[PDB]
Each structure stands twice: as C-alpha cells, then as structure tokens.
Design an enzyme around this catalytic site. Structure first.
Site, PDB file in Angstrom:
ATOM      1  N   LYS A   1       6.158   6.106   7.176  1.00 52.94           N
ATOM      2  CA  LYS A   1       5.363   4.898   6.977  1.00 52.94           C
ATOM      3  C   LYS A   1       6.237   3.695   6.647  1.00 52.94           C
ATOM      4  O   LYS A   1       5.917   2.572   7.050  1.00 52.94           O
ATOM      5  CB  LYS A   1       4.331   5.120   5.869  1.00 52.94           C
ATOM      6  CG  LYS A   1       3.020   5.725   6.349  1.00 52.94           C
TER       7      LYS A   1
ATOM      8  N   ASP B   1      -4.985  -0.802   4.076  1.00 52.61           N
ATOM      9  CA  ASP B   1      -6.245  -0.225   3.622  1.00 52.61           C
ATOM     10  C   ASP B   1      -6.962  -1.118   2.613  1.00 52.61           C
ATOM     11  O   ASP B   1      -8.162  -1.369   2.749  1.00 52.61           O
ATOM     12  CB  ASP B   1      -5.997   1.165   3.031  1.00 52.61           C
ATOM     13  CG  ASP B   1      -5.443   2.139   4.053  1.00 52.61           C
ATOM     14  OD1 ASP B   1      -6.047   2.261   5.138  1.00 52.61           O
ATOM     15  OD2 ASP B   1      -4.407   2.782   3.774  1.00 52.61           O
TER      16      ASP B   1
ATOM     17  N   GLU C   1     -10.084  -1.009   4.890  1.00 49.05           N
ATOM     18  CA  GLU C   1     -10.427   0.196   5.631  1.00 49.05           C
ATOM     19  C   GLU C   1     -11.939   0.380   5.678  1.00 49.05           C
ATOM     20  O   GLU C   1     -12.652   0.053   4.725  1.00 49.05           O
ATOM     21  CB  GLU C   1      -9.757   1.413   4.986  1.00 49.05           C
ATOM     22  CG  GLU C   1     -10.235   2.766   5.494  1.00 49.05           C
ATOM     23  CD  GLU C   1      -9.606   3.161   6.818  1.00 49.05           C
ATOM     24  OE1 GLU C   1      -8.765   2.397   7.339  1.00 49.05           O
ATOM     25  OE2 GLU C   1      -9.960   4.238   7.342  1.00 49.05           O
TER      26      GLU C   1
HETATM   27 MN   LIG Z   1      -3.741   4.438   5.406  1.00 44.57          MN
HETATM   28 MN   LIG Z   2      -6.812   1.390   6.669  1.00 48.85          MN
END
Ligand SMILES: [Mn+2]
Ligand SMILES: [Mn+2]
Ligand SMILES: C[C@H](C[C@@H](C[C@H](C[C@@H](C[C@@H](CCN1CCCC1=O)N1CCCC1=O)N1CCCC1=O)N1CCCC1=O)N1CCCC1=O)N1CCCC1=O
Ligand SMILES: Cc1nnc(C(=O)NC(C)(C)c2nc(C(=O)NCc3ccc(F)cc3)c(O)c(=O)n2C)o1
Length: 180
Positions: A120, A94, A66
């Site tokens: 998710k 991430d 990320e």
């Molecule tokens: Mn995330």
């Molecule tokens: Mn990410």
C-alpha cells in the site's frame, strides 16, 4: 446460478446494508458477487471495518469516503482538499480525519500486516495519507505508529475479524478465502 456456500455465508454474516453496498461496488467495477465470492466476502469485510472505525472517534471527527458512489466520493475529496488545503490523493482513501487533518487508508489482509502495508505504501506514494492495516489474526499496523483511535475501538475490530475467520473455518471456507 452458482449456488456457492460462500455467497450464502456472506449474506448471513454481514448486515443487509453492508451486503447491498458491496454488491453495488462490485458491479460498478464489472464483477459478479455470485462468481467471485471471495472478493464478495472481502468487500463486505473492508466495508464493516471502515464503519466500525468511523464509529470510534468523536461525533464529528471523520468524513466517510468509503461506501459512496465513485463520482460523489471524489466530490467530497475535492471539498476536503479545497477547504483544508491538503494535497489531493491519487487513490481513493476511506476516511478523512478532521482532528489530525489527513486521509486514512484502511486495509484488511490475510497475510502478515507488514506485507500489505508495504504494498500500500508503494502504491500510495502520496504524502500525508495515513495507512492503517488490520489482519485476520489480530494484528494491526499504522503509519508512524499512530493508531488514531484508542485501544478499545481497535480491539473490537480485531475481535470481529477473528470471529469472521472462525465462522469461515467452521464452514470449510477459510482455506480458499486465504488463498487470494
Ligand atoms: Mn482501504
Ligand atoms: Mn475506500
Ligand atoms: C449516513 C447514511 C448511511 C451511512 C452508513 C453508516 C454505517 C453505520 C450504520 C448505523 C445505522 N449503525 C450503527 C449501529 C449499527 C448500524 O447499522 N454503521 C456504524 C457501525 C456499523 C454500521 O453499519 N453510518 C454512519 C453514520 C450513521 C450511519 O448510518 N453511510 C453509508 C456510506 C457513507 C455513510 O455515511 N448515508 C450517508 C449518505 C449516504 C447514506 O446512505
Ligand atoms: C483510484 C483507485 N484505483 N485503484 C484503486 C484501488 O485501490 N482499488 C481496490 C479495489 C483494490 C481498493 N480500493 C480501496 C478504496 O478506498 N478505493 C480500498 O480501501 C481498498 O482497500 N482496496 C483494496 O483506487
């Protein structure tokens, strides 16, 4: 422009390096931080949480996906998958855990933690991608009840999230932020 109170709060609540990365990520997706101010605040929050998270482990534990450019973010994912043999994720994670050998998807939600993870998990549908959700209320929820980091590192993340909530509520900004 649109002189929103939320935009000026975001710029004083998060450090300038986080604000700059969130601006680059929103423009890369064709969105305006001055108009969609709620996603501006959420993008900064998800960014800081991810960086506090990577700071919790050992010195070489995490590779931070990320915050990078989208093309380069997938480039490091390739090198990780091609050197460790882990299956290629469909969605951009991430972090990557060099200790547990898996990618990590970090989420921050204003609803109950099991709502966001349930969404998710359906979207991911990969295999070993570890999911770790944080709420603005102090709750967390991770795959297999494996929370990766020790209690202290996760606790200071929860404290920071509730401080952001209080600062938003003190500015009459929490209500609109929660409805999104
Ligand atoms: Mn995330
Ligand atoms: Mn990410
Ligand atoms: C490495 C470099 C930038 C890093 C940014 C990332 C965030 C880090 C900032 C440090 C300073 N601290 C620590 C004290 C406060 C602060 O501010 N932390 C951690 C806590 C909150 C925060 O903000 N880290 C982590 C390693 C050192 C560093 O700086 N980033 C940006 C995204 C990818 C990445 O690794 N890189 C790498 C290549 C491009 C680039 O710019
Ligand atoms: C590929 C792909 N296609 N859609 C996405 C996506 O999921 N986008 C959003 C912007 C919704 C998102 N992204 C990431 C992330 O790392 N990437 C998050 O971590 C995260 O929390 N969110 C919310 O990813």
């Amino acid at each position: 422009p649109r002189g929103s109170h939320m935009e000026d709060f975001v710029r004083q609540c998060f450090n300038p390096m986080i604000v700059e990365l969130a601006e680059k990520a929103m423009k890369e997706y064709g969105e305006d931080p001055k108009i969609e101010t709620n996603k501006f605040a959420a993008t900064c929050t998800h960014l800081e949480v991810c960086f506090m998270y990577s700071d919790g482990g050992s010195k070489h534990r995490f590779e931070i996906i990320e915050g990078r450019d989208r093309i380069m973010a997938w480039t490091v994912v390739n090198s990780i998958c091609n050197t460790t043999g882990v299956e290629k994720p469909k969605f951009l994670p991430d972090l990557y855990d060099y200790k547990e050998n898996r990618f990590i998807e970090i989420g921050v939600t204003r609803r109950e933690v099991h709502i966001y993870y349930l969404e998710k998990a359906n979207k991911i549908k990969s295999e070993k991608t570890h999911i770790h959700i944080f709420s603005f209320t102090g709750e967390e929820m991770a795959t297999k009840a494996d929370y990766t980091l020790d209690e202290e590192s996760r606790a200071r993340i929860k404290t920071r999230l509730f401080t952001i909530r209080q600062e938003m509520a003190s500015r009459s900004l929490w209500d609109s932020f929660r409805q999104s």
